[PDB]
Amino acid sequence: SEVAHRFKDLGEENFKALVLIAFAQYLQEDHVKLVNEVTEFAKTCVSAENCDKSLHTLFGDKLCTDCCAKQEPERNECFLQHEVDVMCTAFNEETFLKKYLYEIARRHPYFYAPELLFFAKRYKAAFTECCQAADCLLPKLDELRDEGKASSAKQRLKCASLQKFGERAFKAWAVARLSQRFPKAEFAEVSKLVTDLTKVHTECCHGDLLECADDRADLAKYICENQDSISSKLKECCEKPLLEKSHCIAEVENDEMPADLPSLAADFVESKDVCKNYAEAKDVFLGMFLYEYARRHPDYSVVLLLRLAKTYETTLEKCCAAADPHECYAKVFDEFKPLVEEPQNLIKQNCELFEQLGEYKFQNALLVRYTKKVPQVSTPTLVEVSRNLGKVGSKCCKHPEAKRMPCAEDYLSVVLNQLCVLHEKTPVSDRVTKCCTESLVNRRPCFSALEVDETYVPKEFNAETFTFHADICTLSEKERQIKKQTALVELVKHKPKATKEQLKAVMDDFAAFVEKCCKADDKETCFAEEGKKLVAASQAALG
C-alpha cells in the first residue's frame, strides 16, 4: 500500500501538511476535517478494501463526489486544463500555523509542495524568538513572504517546458546545471542525481505530490551521505533538519572546479574515434560533452550550454556522414565563439547603461526601447515589463561578470514566461507569438532579434495623458514613478520616430516638473502655471 509507504516515510506532521496543500489548491477550510479524516483512513490503510486503491484515484474519486466525467488519470490531464499582539496570542500554535499555511497554499496553484513546508518552520522560529524579544518579527516575516511568490513563477516554467518539450530536454537542462554546481563529481554521479531530480519534478508538475516529498527526502538523504563524491560545499547544508537541509541543497553555491583540468578538444575534436563513440552511445556521449563543457564554465547560462551541445550535435550529424569526418569537425570550437559572445556583449552594454543611469532612468530607457519595437502592447503591460527588466539590471549588474549570465538567465526567464502567458490570452503581435512559440534555447535570442515597427502610425495627441495633477504628490514613490512612466510610453506612441535624446529630455522635464510643484506652497497653482512651461518645453524639443 503506497498510502502506507508514504505515511511511514513522510511521517504524520509532514503527511498532514502535504495533504493540506493539494487539497487546498484543488478546491476553493470546510473539508480540513476531511484531511484529518484521511489520516485516520491511513492508519486504517495500515488488506482493507479501499486500501491499496490508487492514490490519485482515491483523491480523484472522492473530492469530485471540477468536471469529474471519467475519474481516471486521463481525467487529470483534462483537470489540469480546467497586529503583533494578536499574532502572539494565537501563539494553539499548531492551529495558528495551520491557518497561516492554508492561506499560502490557497493563494497559488503551482507552488512546489516540498518548499512550502519549509517556509512555515522558519515562520515558527521567528515567532518563538520574537515573543521572548521585547518587540523584530515583522522583518523576518517580510523576508520569507517576499521569497515565495517567485517560486510559483519558475515552477510554471519548468512544467510547461516539460510539456512543451520532452524529458530529454529536461534531463539535458539538469545535466548542465548540476555539472556547474558539482564539477568535482564524475559523470555517472551527476547522471544519477538528474534522473532522481527529474522524477521528483515530473511528479509534482504531474501534481501527484505524494511521492516527490518522499523522493525529495531520499534525494537529500543520498547527497549528505555521499558528499565525498559530490561537493565540498555540502557540509553545513548537511547538518540541518530535513526541510531546511533539503531546501538548502537547492540553494548551495557552486563548488570549485578541479585544478589543471584537460582541454575538452582531445576526446571531442582531436580524436578519430568520436563518430564511432557517437554511434555506440549517442545521448550518453552528448550528455558527457555537456558535463565537461558545463563543469568548466559556471559563468555560463544553462541555455547557452544547451546551445553549444546542440551545435556540437548538429556538427556530428553532418560531419560523420562526410568524406573525412575528422577534418569536417576540426573547426567546431570556432563555432562556439559567437554563441558565447552575443549574450556577453548584451550583458556588457546593458550593465554599462544601468551603471551610468541608475535603476529609474534605466527603466525609462528600456521603456523607450520596447515601445518602439512593439507599439501595440498596452501601456500598463509595457510599464510593468520594463519596470521588471530594470530590476533584473539592479540584481545582476552588482555581481562581477563571472556571475552575470546565470543571474540574468534566472530572473529574465521568469519575466519572459509571464510575458508569454499574457500574450497568449490576448495576442497583439505575431512576432511575439513566434518568440513565445520557439524552443527555449531560442526564446531570448528571438526577443533580442525584435526590430522597431516602422509601420506603426502615431497616436493622435491627447492632452490629458501628459497632464499631471496635485494628487500625485500624495503617492508612494512607486506609484508616482509609474505615473510618469505611463506618460513616457504614451509619448513614444505619439512620437515613435523621435530620438531617445529628445524623448529623454522630455521625460526629465516631467520629472523636474513634478519635483518642483510638490515642493511649492500652493500646489494647485503650481501645477496649472508651470504646466504651461512644460507644454512649451516638450513643444520646443519634440513639437
Epitope: 564524475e186 559523470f187 555517472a188 554521479e189 544519477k192 543520498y222 551521505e225 555521499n226 565525498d228 563524491s229 584537460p262 582531445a266 576526446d267 580524436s271 574515434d273 564511432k276 563513440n277 557517437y278 555506440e280 552511445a281 550518453v284 556521449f285 558527457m288
Partner: nanobody, 126 residues
Framework: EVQLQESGGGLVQPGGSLRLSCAAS????????MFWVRQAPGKGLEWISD????????RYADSVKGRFTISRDNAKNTLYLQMNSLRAEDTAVYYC???????????????????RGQGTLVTVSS
Amino acid sequence: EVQLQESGGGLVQPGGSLRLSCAASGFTFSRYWMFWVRQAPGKGLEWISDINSGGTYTRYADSVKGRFTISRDNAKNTLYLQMNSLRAEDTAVYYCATNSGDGKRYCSGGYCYRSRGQGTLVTVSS
C-alpha cells in the same frame, strides 16, 4: 597506471552460481564508480550492473536483476560480482570498467568507459 584485472571464471552449469572479482591499480578505488559489462556469443557489450564509489547505490539491467549482486571492498581495491541462478544466456566474457583517470573515452554498447580489464570468460553449459 590504471589497471583492472578480472578473476573467477570457468565452466559452470544451469541453476548454479559464481563470484567474479576485480583488482584496481593506478588511482584510488574509493573515489570512483565501477561497472560490470558482458559480451555474449553473438552480441556486443551488455551493461549489467553499476556501483557508486561509496557502495551506497547499485543499478541492474533487467536481464540480471534479482539474481545478481554487485558490491565492493574499498580497502582491498576489489570489486565483486556475485552471480546466482545462472542460465544459458549468462555465457559471456565478463569485464569490469571505470571512468577514473584522464585517459581516452571508449564508447561501446550504449555507454562509455576510460579503462577496462582483460576480461574473464564464464561458460554456462547444461
